[PDB]
Design a protein around this ligand. Structure first.
Ligand SMILES: CCCCCCCCCCCCCCCCCC(=O)OC[C@H](COP(=O)([O-])OCC[N+](C)(C)C)OC(=O)CCCCCCCCCCCCCCCCC
Ligand SMILES: CCCCCCCCCCCCCCCCCC(=O)OC[C@H](COP(=O)(O)OCCN)OC(=O)CCCCCCCCCCCCCCCCC
Ligand SMILES: NC(=O)C1=CN([C@@H]2O[C@H](COP(=O)(O)OP(=O)(O)OC[C@H]3O[C@@H](n4cnc5c(N)ncnc54)[C@H](OP(=O)(O)O)[C@@H]3O)[C@@H](O)[C@H]2O)C=CC1
Ligand code: SF4
Ligand code: SF4
Ligand code: SF4
Lengths: 158, 210, 84, 176, 115, 320, 388
């Protein structure tokens, strides 16, 4: 066989970028109304599991966190704690409008104005609640966002 | 009842009963009851001196004609324009007679009200909330502390003089690897719309001159 | 075992540990309020320090009178019950 | 009018008892439980195929706010600030000055798609049907800033989808 | 007239008692707090901070208020004792991340508008 | 100052400071504190980077909306460099490595890359500039890291004569590779191999101390053109430190890894810097001048190695 | 106290009821005490509403109990109607009732299924949730929003039902009762389910009254009380349905009661479709009900009243009141207080799950640790309204 160093990296890099997106195990934070849609997205109609996205995973063996609902100041420390326990790679997805900018409760003293303050978010899903189909678009969108990752190529060019 | 679909049909019979049941409690506990009034939408109001929280609530719970077994609700209404700024309110239910009565008191920051937990086990937490959000203290409460606000909340939110946006907003800091707090800064200020119409709305409720 | 002298010893040594107290003005009958001139809050720490040093509880109401190092010696006499 | 839910008295006849005794030692009701599940195996799953298929919606659906134009092309909005004054979350910001030709029109018009609650009040209060909500919902973004739509973004979306927004409004303006 | 219902203490002489009772409660707890939460401040620092919050309330005079201030303290301590608080909640008294806020006049006139 | 950079607010997260800072190589251990401190007060920040955009995520919470930007660039290219510095009120260069690759040797990261950045800033008319030099810079020094470093300290002082070159000593912190270097790398799976660490004097500094120094330098108008070095307040011996470290880390101690792909550990040249003494430069202004006090290693070494400590320690003796 | 454990739901599992931090005091295997911490979702809803117009505040009540939406809005609507001294048109009262029962179907499906999800019974979660999906369309086809419809407003509803909807709700109702019978065919008679919810969390009749319980908690231990029968509001006086009553008081009866209530909802919907009357959908009092766009764009007065009701809202007479409804979970009501301005002065929200949770300590005495799973679930606790 024959191939340059760059080429072999891409193909074996393309593999992992496919494995790490064909099998996502999302931790779920059912904090508020938008938690319900997350259940529908797993319900029979859409069956998020049909894409490999399992329903339940140990928070310490997750693959992506979907912050769903409001993020109270009291509950904020717990969220950050959970975030640090996630093994890498860890992708955080903000779901809804209270998990993005405080939504309806932007001006509430006890509401964290956007979960992005507590952690770095990857995908932002609008809509309070985001229809169970829209949320599924974000997850599919996330897989592509993974698919546009070139770790090894950048490593080979260090 | 009347033939007007855009108006609320009055039920005078129930209104008459409350007035009849009015003096019934005004005569029985005159040491505390200050004022009893009945609203046109069939809701009885009893005004009690704060001391009489237990004598009056305990009475209605057990008397042979009140029988108000269950406590519907328990809150307070901050009103900074009165010497006793706060104003407790007890909403009582009566399955036997199928009626509801409202009992109100008056207190302030530094004049605690006896815990009504002995009268009803329902107020075990409602009294924590009132203290938590308003600051009123309840005497002899089995376990009084914050129930809603965040730990170490240096303030009583639901008071009318507590800014809506609070005093500290959280955030995560990498330098210290822990959530932190700082004085609140808003990307966009809360716009304060002024809505009051300058023309008298209801002549019935007009407050006479000074 | 009893060493009523020891009570006079540790107490003087212990107050030496309290950084606020200047060693020179310390005496078996020094005045906390004026000689040392500490805070009533501070003397509470001292009382607590003695509790650990002598290993037993000290009531607060008593602690609101032990204004001089001697009374720590005198008051602890009844508690220890040493009658040299 | 009420009814009793759990007030059955097990008749003590031998045959009846033998049934309750038969049930325990033979798990029959549990065998029945395996029956209902088996049926659902041979049913047809209600799973649609996304994105090649979509979940049915209605003309009233609420989605991505957008700004419309008359058939001529002119902006419908006239900066009346009804939508701002009613948006419950105060997600709307507006400014206006008399345009060159002396016509009331906006200069700054911003909707915060993270403070929005997607309530539909804005499209209710518009006296000229300018600000509406299109049937689009797949607009998740990788950054917070992208979800702050200003006048230019809203106008583009309105032009982008206008072929459909009118179609929905046409079928539904009568109920309003 | 000044007829007012008290809460716990009928006069400052009794009220001041619980303050000293309370101070010991913190003074003996700071060592536990540092180790329990694995904070990174020496046991000495906590008590010094503790005195400040007690000290800033020295000016108080109303018997009821001191009862109230005391009542809050127990709740603050009880949460700390039971570990209901979290490492974050403990350090909020020290204001680490906050940079030095200027306080003299010429400092203010160079940075902004706040008097 | 430009009309849009006039100070506004109270210096919080969403307050506008007026410091449009462009940080090069901000992904490093030192940068993330500088970014965080700049983000703290809400100063506009541009962050060119080379790694995956994934690796820059942890910087995002550190800045308000639209205050952190993640462009792309390459050291070998100057077209990219110009974009990131076109309108910056100041530019900070933090590039560097602890080992050499087959792409960028020590000179490239320590001479040309620091320079190429400097010229474009002059070309673009950047009003200020900051450069991180090494305390032990000398062309006659043994450590090629230092010998390569010593070259850069000259061009930066020449291409941008007003650039405030800074020469900090060894730095330590939560993510540092110095205190964590001894605890894990030196000992794990391997008995200490210290080559008679009896003569060396090491005077490390705390990362937060360095971070506060840089920001104060940006604000100061008189700091233009000067040169600084940051050193802890207490000097130490190499051998004394390692022994003391195992007390905090509670690892067994016995007084007295090659170069590979990935990120090598215990490199050939890295050793020379551990043994190399910390220069004594009493004439150069240091931290105390910037309104910053050195924090003793005793106070803060507890937090860094607390994680090393699995599941009452006399502070290390000093050497004058 | 032997070893107190801070059993936490913060790492929320697939139950979607909220986040609960629970502090307990065990004695070996058996639990002995409990102390729920509920501040984890307090957003301050009861304080913001003091800055909104009564119209602007309506969407909040939708987000209190995010599984019984339209029931919540009805509770708020009745309170404003009562203070406004106006009645919604008779057609409106049927629509609101029509969806109250549909919402009650939505609530119980979540309650029974998730209550079975927590105990490992996972299959019944999906089957019924498919029906929830079908019912969402009825929400979506009338109001355009799958969940937070805000369809019900003070004065009736917003838009009339579209064509072909009632003819399609009927289709759902007809076959629905077959769905429940499948559900019972795996929960009721199953012995494993019985072992978990019989003689568990028994609540004495007198205590239930004292602690302040309502709904299936009261009626799950014999107490005959349902506000749809004693204090009807819209049309419930004009329909036929039997309030199921349990006798044991354990969890099992409450599970039976909820399943029986859903059937009693179908018996009502069957009567709502057949009896639905014609007429307008909102009070024909323009000062409270903004006119339809047709008149707004044509008539002068019709415009002004569409220019004030969307910037200043409608004034309400000074006063206060407490109005409650038999929401799916239990009694739900608001102590709205109006001082004459278009913004409420105060609004206390009597969440049925607030009292049912405080009483968890009482119910949890002398039960294994795993039984708190089957005890919290049986109360149908959603922390949206516990904290508000
Ligand atoms: C060479 C061995 C190295 C060690 C590797 C580990 C051991 C070997 C295990 C290999 C497992 C086989 C993996 C096959 C992956 C194919 C995925 C697929 O089905 O295509 C659909 C995928 C799906 O694409 P998609 O994700 O965009 O689909 C979108 C969703 N639908 C389809 C519904 C619209 O297509 C691709 O994206 C391209 C896949 C590229 C796979 C690259 C890895 C191939 C394996 C390495 C061989 C390299 C040879 C040398 C060059
Ligand atoms: C598995 C395939 C699916 C089975 C479908 C259900 C079925 O056919 O059997 C159900 C039947 C009804 O039982 P039941 O509802 O309890 O009424 C009788 C009361 N004695 O229950 C039965 O009678 C089934 C009895 C099966 C035999 C007992 C199990 C023996 C196991 C070893 C073989
Ligand atoms: N502890 C110390 O060494 C002390 C600090 N200094 C100096 O401080 C500076 C920053 O410290 P520190 O953060 O720990 O250093 P780092 O090892 O963390 O690297 C700093 C940045 O340089 C980047 N980098 C490496 N190679 C290149 C390249 N060809 N082109 C562009 N970027 C590149 C790195 O990105 P990537 O990871 O993707 O390669 C990284 O973001 C150093 O340069 C050092 O000389 C001086 C005295 C003591
Ligand atoms: S983001 Fe949506 S679902 Fe979540 S709390 Fe806010 S309104 Fe409810
Ligand atoms: S849908 Fe409601 S919250 Fe969203 S922009 Fe329109 S009016 Fe505002
Ligand atoms: S309500 Fe309509 S016309 Fe008025 S400002 Fe808003 S978008 Fe423009």
């Amino acid at each position: 066989p024959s191939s340059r160093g760059e080429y072999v990296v891409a193909k074996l890099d393309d593999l992992i970028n496919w494995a790490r997106r064909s099998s996502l195990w999302p931790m779920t934070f059912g904090l508020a109304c938008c938690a319900v849609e997350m259940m529908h997205m797993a319900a029979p109609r859409y069956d998020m599991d049909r894409f490999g996205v399992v329903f339940r995973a140990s928070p310490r063996q997750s693959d992506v966190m979907i912050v769903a609902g409001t993020l109270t100041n009291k509950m904020a420390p717990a969220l950050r704690k959970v975030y640090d326990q996630m093994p890498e790679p860890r992708y955080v997805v903000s779901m809804g409008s209270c998990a993005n900018g405080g939504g309806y409760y932007h001006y509430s003293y006890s509401v964290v104005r956007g979960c992005d303050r507590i952690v770095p978010v990857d995908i932002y899903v609008p809509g309070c609640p985001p229809t169970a189909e829209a949320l599924l678009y974000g997850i599919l969108q996330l897989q592509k966002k993974i698919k546009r990752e070139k770790r090894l190529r950048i490593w080979y060019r260090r | 009842a009347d033939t007007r679909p855009t108006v609320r049909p009055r039920n005078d019979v129930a209104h008459k009963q409350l007035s009849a049941f009015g003096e019934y409690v005004a005569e029985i506990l005159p040491k505390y009851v200050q004022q009893v009034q009945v609203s046109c939408f069939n809701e009885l109001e009893i005004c009690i001196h704060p001391d009489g929280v237990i004598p009056v609530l305990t009475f209605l719970r057990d008397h042979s004609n009140a029988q108000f077994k269950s406590l519907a609700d328990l809150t307070a209404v901050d009103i900074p324009t009165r010497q006793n700024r706060f104003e407790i309110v007890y909403n009582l239910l009566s399955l036997r007679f199928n009626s509801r009565i409202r009992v109100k008191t008056y207190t302030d920051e530094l004049t605690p009200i006896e815990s009504s937990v002995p009268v009803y086990k329902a107020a075990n937490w409602y009294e924590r909330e009132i203290w938590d959000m308003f600051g009123v203290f309840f005497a002899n409460h089995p376990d009084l502390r914050r129930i809603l606000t965040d730990y170490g909340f240096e303030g009583h939110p639901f008071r009318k003089d507590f800014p809506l946006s609070g005093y500290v907003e959280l955030r995560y800091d990498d330098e210290v690897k822990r959530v932190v707090a700082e004085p609140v800064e808003l990307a966009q200020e809360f716009r304060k719309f002024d809505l009051n119409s300058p023309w008298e709305a209801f002549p019935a409720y007009r407050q006479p001159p000074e | 075992p009893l060493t009523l002298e020891g009570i006079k010893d540790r107490v003087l040594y212990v107050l030496k540990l309290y950084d606020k107290i200047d060693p020179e003005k310390l005496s078996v009958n020094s005045h906390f309020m004026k000689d040392l001139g500490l805070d009533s809050l501070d003397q509470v720490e001292i009382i607590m320090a003695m509790e650990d040093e002598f290993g037993f509880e000290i009531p607060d109401i008593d602690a609101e009178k032990l204004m001089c190092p001697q009374e720590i010696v005198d008051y602890i006499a009844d508690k220890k019950d040493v009658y040299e | 009018t009420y009814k009793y839910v759990n007030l059955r008295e097990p008749s003590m006849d031998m045959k009846s008892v033998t049934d309750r005794a038969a049930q325990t030692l033979l798990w029959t009701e549990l065998i029945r439980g395996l029956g209902m599940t088996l049926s659902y195996l041979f049913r047809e799953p209600a799973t649609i195929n996304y994105p090649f298929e979509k979940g049915p919606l209605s003309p009233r659906f609420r989605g991505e706010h957008a700004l419309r134009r008359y058939p001529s092309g002119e902006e419908r909005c006239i900066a009346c600030k009804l939508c701002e004054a009613v948006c419950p979350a105060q997600a709307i910001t507006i400014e206006a000055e008399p345009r060159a030709d002396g016509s009331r029109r906006t200069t700054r018009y911003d909707i915060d798609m993270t403070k929005c609650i997607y309530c539909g009040f804005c499209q209710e209060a518009c006296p000229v049907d300018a600000i509406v909500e299109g049937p689009n919902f797949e607009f998740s973004t990788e950054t917070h800033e992208e979800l702050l739509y200003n006048k230019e973004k809203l106008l583009n979306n309105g032009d982008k989808w206008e072929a459909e927004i009118a179609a929905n409004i046409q079928a539904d303006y009568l109920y309003r | 007239s000044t007829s007012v219902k008290p809460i716990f203490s009928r006069d400052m002489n009794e009220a001041k008692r619980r303050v000293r009772e309370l101070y010991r409660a913190w003074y003996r707890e700071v060592p536990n707090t540092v180790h329990l939460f694995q904070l990174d401040i020496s046991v000495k620092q906590g008590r010094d901070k503790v005195r400040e919050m007690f000290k800033k309330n020295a000016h108080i005079t109303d018997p009821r208020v001191v009862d109230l201030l005391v009542i809050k303290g127990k709740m603050e301590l009880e949460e700390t004792i039971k570990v209901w608080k979290q490492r974050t909640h403990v350090m909020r008294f020290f204001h680490e991340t906050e940079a030095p806020r200027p306080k003299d006049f010429l400092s203010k006139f160079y940075v902004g508008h706040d008097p | 100052l430009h009309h849009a950079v006039i100070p506004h607010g109270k210096g919080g997260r969403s307050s506008v400071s007026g410091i449009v800072a462009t940080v090069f190589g901000a992904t490093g251990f030192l940068g993330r504190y500088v970014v965080n401190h700049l983000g703290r007060m809400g100063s506009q920040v541009i962050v060119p980077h080379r790694c995956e955009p994934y690796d820059t995520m942890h910087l995002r919470p550190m800045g308000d909306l639209g205050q952190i930007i993640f462009m792309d660039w390459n050291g070998r290219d100057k077209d990219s460099i110009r974009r990131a510095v076109e309108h910056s009120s100041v530019v900070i260069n933090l590039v560097g490595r602890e080992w050499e690759t087959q792409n960028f040797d020590f000179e490239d990261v320590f001479v040309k890359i620091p320079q190429a950045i400097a010229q474009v800033s002059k070309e673009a008319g950047v009003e200020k500039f900051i450069h991180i030099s090494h305390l032990n810079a000398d062309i006659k020094s043994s450590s090629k890291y230092l010998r390569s470093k010593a070259v850069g300290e000259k061009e930066v002082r020449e291409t941008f004569p007003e650039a405030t070159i800074i020469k900090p000593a060894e730095i330590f912190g939560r993510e540092d590779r110095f205190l964590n270097y001894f605890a894990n790398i030196r000992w794990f799976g391997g008995v200490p191999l210290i080559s008679l660490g009896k003569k060396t004097v090491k005077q490390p500094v705390y990362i937060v101390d360095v971070t506060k120094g840089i920001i104060n330098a940006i604000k100061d108008p008189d700091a233009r053109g000067k040169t600084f070095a940051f050193v802890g307040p207490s000097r130490y011996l190499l051998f004394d430190l390692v022994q003391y470290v195992f007390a905090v880390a509670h690892r067994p101690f016995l007084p007295y890894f090659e170069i590979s792909p990935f990120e090598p550990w215990t490199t050939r040249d890295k050793v020379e810097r551990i043994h190399t003494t910390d220069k004594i430069l009493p004439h150069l202004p240091g931290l105390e001048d910037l309104g910053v006090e050195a924090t003793p290693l005793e106070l803060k070494a507890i937090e860094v190695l607390r994680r090393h400590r699995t599941y009452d320690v006399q502070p290390a003796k000093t050497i004058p | 106290l032997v070893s107190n454990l801070t059993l936490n739901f913060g790492p929320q599992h697939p139950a979607a009821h909220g986040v609960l931090r629970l502090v307990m005091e065990l004695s070996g295997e058996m639990v002995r005490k409990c102390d729920p911490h509920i501040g984890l979702l307090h957003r301050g809803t009861e304080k913001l509403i003091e800055y909104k117009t009564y119209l602007q505040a309506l969407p909040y009540f939708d987000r209190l109990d995010y599984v019984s939406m339209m029931c919540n809005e009805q509770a708020y609507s009745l309170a404003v109607e009562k203070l406004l001294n106006i009645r919604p048109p008779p057609r409106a009262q049927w629509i609101r009732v029509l969806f109250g029962e549909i919402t009650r179907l939505l609530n119980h499906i979540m309650a029974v299924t998730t209550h079975a999800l927590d105990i490992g019974a996972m299959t019944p979660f999906f089957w019924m949730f498919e029906e929830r999906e079908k019912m969402f369309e009825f929400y979506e086809r009338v109001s355009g929003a799958r969940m937070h419809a805000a369809y019900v407003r003070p004065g009736g509803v917003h838009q009339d039902l579209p064509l072909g909807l009632m003819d399609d709700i009927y289709e759902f109702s007809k076959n629905f009762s077959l769905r429940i019978d499948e559900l019972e065919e795996m929960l009721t008679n199953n012995r494993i389910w019985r072992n978990r919810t019989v003689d568990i969390g028994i609540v004495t009749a007198e205590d239930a009254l004292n602690y302040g319980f309502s709904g299936v908690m009261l009626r799950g231990s014999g107490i005959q009380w349902d506000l749809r029968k004693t204090q009807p509001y819209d049309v419930y006086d004009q329909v036929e349905f039997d309030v199921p009553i349990g006798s044991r008081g354990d969890c099992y009866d409450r599970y039976l009661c909820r399943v029986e209530e859903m059937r009693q909802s179908i018996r009502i919907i069957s009567q709502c479709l057949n009896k639905m009357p014609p007429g307008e959908i909102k009070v024909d009092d323009a000062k409270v009900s903004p006119p339809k766009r047709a008149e707004m764009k044509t008539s002068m007065e019709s415009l002004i009243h569409h220019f004030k009701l969307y910037t200043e809202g409608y004034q309400v007479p000074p006063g206060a009141t407490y109005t409650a409804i038999e929401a799916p979970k239990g009694e739900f009501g608001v102590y709205l207080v109006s001082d004459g301005s278009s913004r409420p002065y105060r609004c206390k929200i009597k969440a049925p799950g607030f009292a049912h949770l405080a009483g968890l300590d009482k119910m949890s005495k002398g039960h294994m640790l795993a039984d708190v799973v089957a005890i919290i679930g049986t109360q149908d606790i959603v922390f949206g309204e516990v904290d508000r």
